[PDB]
Design a protein around this ligand. Structure first.
Ligand SMILES: *C(=O)[C@H](Cc1ccccc1)NC(=O)[C@H](CC(C)C)NC(=O)[C@@H](NC(=O)N[C@@H](Cc1ccccc1)C(=O)O)[C@@H]1CCN=C(N)N1
Ligand SMILES: [Ca+2]
Length: 356
C-alpha cells in the first residue's frame, strides 16, 4: 500500500525507507490493525487533531497532582486531554533542568501507532485501523510511579479503586517513558498483572547512551524493550543498549542525519504552553520514545491479522519472541559493547511468520 497522505513520501522514512524503515508498505497489504486497542501511556492527547479523530477512544487521566496535570484538582478524571507539559523556568524539575515548550509527546506517539492513513491529510500511522486508548500519566516535569502503575493495571483490564471498569482493555501497552533505577516492587507487579491478562507491554529503552539495565521500565522483566536506530539502520547517538534491549525501531538520528532524515514525523501542535496557544501541526521528534510505538503497532497489526483469520492472539511471551525472531538484521555494524537487540522491527516479516 502506497497511501496518499501528502507528507508521507517526503518525511516518513521510518515507515518506508529500505535501510531504516519498518517495511510498513508491504505489511499494510496484509493488516492495518483493525479490531485491536493499543494503550498509550504518555503526556495525554490532542483528541480533535484532524489526522487522529476517528481512531481515538476517550481514555483517562491518571495524574493525581494538580500542579503536574494542570487541572483544577488532584483527582484522576475521564478523558486524556493534554493540558501542556511546558516548564517555564530552568531548574524547576530538578537542579540543572532546562526550561522548555510543551511536547505534545503523547499525540506524536499516538500518531505513530494509529494516525489516520490514506485520507489525503498530513502523515500516515502504522496500525491505522486500530484504536488508541490514551491514558495520560505524564504532565509538567513528568509523572509519578504510582499513577503509572495504576494506569497499566486499568489499561490492561485490571481493577483500580476509584476508576470505573475499562470497557476497552488493550491488547498492547506502549510506554514511551522511564526514569533511572530498578524495576520492581510496584512496577514489576503492575506489569506482571498486565501480562497475566494477555497484554503485551512495549517500552522505550531510554536515551542516556547507557545500559538499559539501569532504567525502568526498560529493565523490567517480561516487557519488550526497544532501542533506537537511524535512517541508516545503525544505532542513534543517544540509544541505551545492553542485553535487556530486545530489538530496535526507528527513533531518528538527530541533526547528523538532517531534516527530515534525523526525525520521526507525526501529528502534534506548535503550541508553546496551552493547546490554545498554538494549532494542530505535524512535528519531527527523535528518541527511543518514537521507536517503541513502531514496535507496539506491529504487535497490533499481528493480533489483528490473527483475529481476522480466526486464529488465537499470541500470548505476551510469544509476541516478544516473534518480534525478535523476525527483526531485520542491522544494515550497519553494531559495536558489540552497545547491543540493541536482534534487529529493526520488520512489520511484514512479523506478519508472515505469525500467519504461517
Ligand atoms: C522518549 O524518548 C523518552 C523515553 C525515556 C525512556 C527511559 C528513560 C527516560 C525517557 N520519554 C520521555 O522522556 C517522556 C516524554 C517527554 C520527555 C515529554 N517523559 C518521561 O519519561 C518522564 N519520566 C518521568 O517522569 N519519570 C518519573 C516517574 C517514573 C518513576 C519510575 C519509573 C518510570 C517513571 C520518575 O520519577 O522517574 C521525564 C523523562 C525522564 N525523567 C523525568 N523526570 N521526566
Ligand atoms: Ca493522514
Amino acid at each position: 500500500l502506497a497511501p496518499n497522505d501528502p507528507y508521507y513520501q517526503q518525511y516518513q522514512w521510518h515507515l518506508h525507507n529500505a535501510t531504516g524503515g519498518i517495511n510498513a508498505p508491504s505489511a499494510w497489504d496484509v493488516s492495518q490493525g483493525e479490531g485491536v486497542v493499543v494503550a498509550v501511556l504518555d503526556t495525554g492527547i490532542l483528541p480533535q487533531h484532524p489526522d487522529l479523530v476517528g481512531n481515538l477512544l476517550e481514555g483517562y487521566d491518571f495524574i493525581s497532582d494538580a500542579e503536574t496535570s494542570r487541572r483544577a484538582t488532584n483527582d484522576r478524571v475521564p478523558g486524556a486531554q493534554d493540558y501542556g507539559d511546558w516548564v517555564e523556568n530552568d531548574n524547576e524539575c530538578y537542579t540543572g533542568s532546562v526550561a522548555e515548550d510543551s511536547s505534545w509527546h503523547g499525540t506524536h506517539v499516538a500518531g505513530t501507532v494509529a494516525e489516520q492513513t490514506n485520507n489525503g491529510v498530513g502523515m500516515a500511522g502504522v496500525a491505522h485501523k486500530a484504536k488508541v486508548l490514551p491514558v495520560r500519566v505524564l504532565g509538567k516535569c513528568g509523572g509519578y510511579l504510582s499513577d503509572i502503575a495504576d494506569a497499566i493495571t486499568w489499561a490492561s483490564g485490571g481493577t483500580v479503586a476509584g476508576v470505573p471498569a475499562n470497557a476497552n482493555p488493550a491488547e498492547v501497552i506502549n510506554m514511551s517513558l522511564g526514569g533511572s533505577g530498578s524495576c520492581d516492587g510496584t512496577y514489576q507487579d503492575a506489569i506482571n498483572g498486565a501480562i497475566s491478562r494477555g497484554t503485551t507491554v512495549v517500552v522505550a529503552a531510554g536515551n542516556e547512551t547507557d545500559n538499559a539495565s539501569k532504567y525502568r521500565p526498560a529493565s523490567c522483566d517480561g516487557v519488550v524493550t526497544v532501542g533506537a536506530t537511524r535512517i541508516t539502520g545503525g544505532i542513534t547517538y543517544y540509544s541505551n543498549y545492553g542485553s535487556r534491549v530486545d530489538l530496535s525501531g526507528p527513533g531518528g538520528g538527530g541533526s547528523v542525519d538532517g531534516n527530515p532524515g534525523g526525525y520521526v514525523w507525526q501529528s502534534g501542535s506548535d503550541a508553546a504552553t496551552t493547546p490554545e496557544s498554538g494549532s494542530y501541526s505535524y512535528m519531527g521528534m527523535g528518541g527511543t520514545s518514537m521507536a517503541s510505538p513502531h514496535v507496539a503497532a506491529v504487535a497490533a497489526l499481528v493480533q489483528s491479522a490473527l483475529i481476522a483469520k480466526g486464529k488465537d492472539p499470541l500470548a505476551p511471551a510469544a509476541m516478544r519472541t516473534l518480534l525478535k525472531e523476525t527483526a531485520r538484521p542491522f544494515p550497519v555494524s553494531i559495536p558489540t559493547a552497545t547491543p540493541i537487540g536482534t534487529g529493526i522491527v520488520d512489520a511484514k516479516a512479523a506478519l508472515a511468520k505469525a500467519l504461517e
